[PDB]
Every structure is written in structure tokens, then in C-alpha cells.
């Protein structure tokens, strides 16, 4: 990944989803892109073929909770189960340890960040793909925010996500983007900061 050119950070919630979630991951390897999925721990007991290709394909996978609940709505020991139990899932179809979390509808306090043990990682562009759940109008919104070093909010359970985020791949790999994973991203903002501490010996 080269600092010197665009990056950004496609991230993809509430999967795996085969029919969605593997049209996506086409999508990435067709354009020579990768992207992050936040998965849910029951659907990758549903799918852990989706898992493993996802891995296998070079992209990052993050941990999303077991079912979706809010996890501020529960007991610290249910919610920190809900993110144990997808770490555990996880980890025994695939030997993988998440790094990043992303609770669900973003409800998160003090309290389980100190306890999760877990890198919180939010998104700064959110078409709301659930809620305008139309191709053309996802694609145009995120094409309207994207920009560098910016992290993108889709979630790869709707057939009009996928849609869109095909497109969406295309036209910012047309642009000149590198489409790295969220752990991509911030190393390539540490190597861009890095060009200050040329100031010491200036
Ligand atoms: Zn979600």
C-alpha cells in the first residue's frame, strides 16, 4: 500500500450473507481491492465457508456481536459474551483473532470499552444502506462523501448493498483509490504522520 496515493476503507456490517456477502467479495478480487467485514458470530456459525474466504481473499475481519443487540441495553457479562462468543466462533473455524469492534448501532460506553479488550472502529461515511435500501441512491452518497483516508458504513445482507457496492468498487478503483482494510488504513496515516519526525534532523 503506498502512502502517496488515495486510500479508503470499504466496511461491511451484519454478515456473512453467502448470496451478498460472496457477490462483494468478487467484487473486491475482480478490482484488486480489500475491505472489512464486522461479522455477526451467529451468521458465521451459519456460513464459516464465508469466513474463510474472506480471510483467504486478504481481507479484515472484525467482530460484530453473536445476535445484535445494543450492547449498552445488557449486563457488562452479557454483552462482553455476546463479543466473547463471536471471538470464540470465530477463532474455531479459523484460527483468527479479531482486533477491531464495532458495536452494533454504534452504542458503546466506558464502561465495555475498558472490559472488551478490543479496538473500537467507527466509519465516518454512512449512506444508510438499511434505511434507503436503493442502489442508485447508496452509490451516489457514498461517491458524493468518499474521499481519502475516509472509512465507508455498508452492510453486505441486502441485494441492493451488494449491487451498489459493486459499483461503488469499480468507480473508486477508476479514481485512483487503494481499497485497504481498516488496520491498512491506519498504518498508512502512521507512515504519512511519520514525515514530521523528518523535522527533527531538518
Ligand atoms: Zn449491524
Known amino acids: 500500500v503506498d502512502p502517496n496515493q488515495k486510500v479508503i476503507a470499504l466496511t461491511f456490517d451484519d454478515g456473512p450473507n453467502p448470496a451478498t456477502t460472496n ?4 467484487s473486491l478480487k475482480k478490482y484488486k481491492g480489500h475491505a472489512t467485514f464486522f461479522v455477526l458470530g451467529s451468521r458465521v456459525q451459519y456460513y464459516p465457508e464465508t469466513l474463510i474466504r474472506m480471510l483467504k ?4 475481519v472484525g467482530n460484530h456481536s ?23 466462533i470465530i477463532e474455531k473455524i479459523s484460527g483468527y483473532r479479531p482486533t477491531l469492534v464495532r458495536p452494533p448501532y ?21 449512506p444508510e444502506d438499511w434505511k434507503d435500501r436503493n442502489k442508485k441512491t ?17 452492510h453486505d445482507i441486502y441485494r441492493t448493498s451488494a449491487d451498489a457496492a459493486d459499483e461503488i468498487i469499480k468507480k473508486l478503483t477508476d479514481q485512483g483509490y487503494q481499497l485497504v482494510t481498516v488496520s491498512q488504513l491506519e498504518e498508512v496515516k502512521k507512515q504519512r504522520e ?9
Open 106 to 126: 454504534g452504542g458503546i460506553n466506558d464502561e465495555l470499552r475498558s472490559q472488551m479488550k478490543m479496538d473500537v472502529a467507527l466509519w465516518d461515511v454512512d
Open 66 to 88: 453473536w445476535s445484535h443487540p445494543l450492547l449498552t441495553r445488557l449486563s457488562v457479562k452479557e454483552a462482553l459474551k455476546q463479543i466473547n462468543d463471536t471471538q470464540d
Open 138 to 154: 447508496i452509490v451516489d452518497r457514498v461517491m458524493n462523501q468518499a474521499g481519502d483516508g475516509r472509512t465507508i458504513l455498508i
Open 23 to 26: 457477490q462483494i467479495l468478487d
Open 194 to 202: 511519520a514525515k514530521e519526525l523528518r523535522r527533527q534532523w531538518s
Open 57 to 60: 481473499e486478504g481481507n479484515e
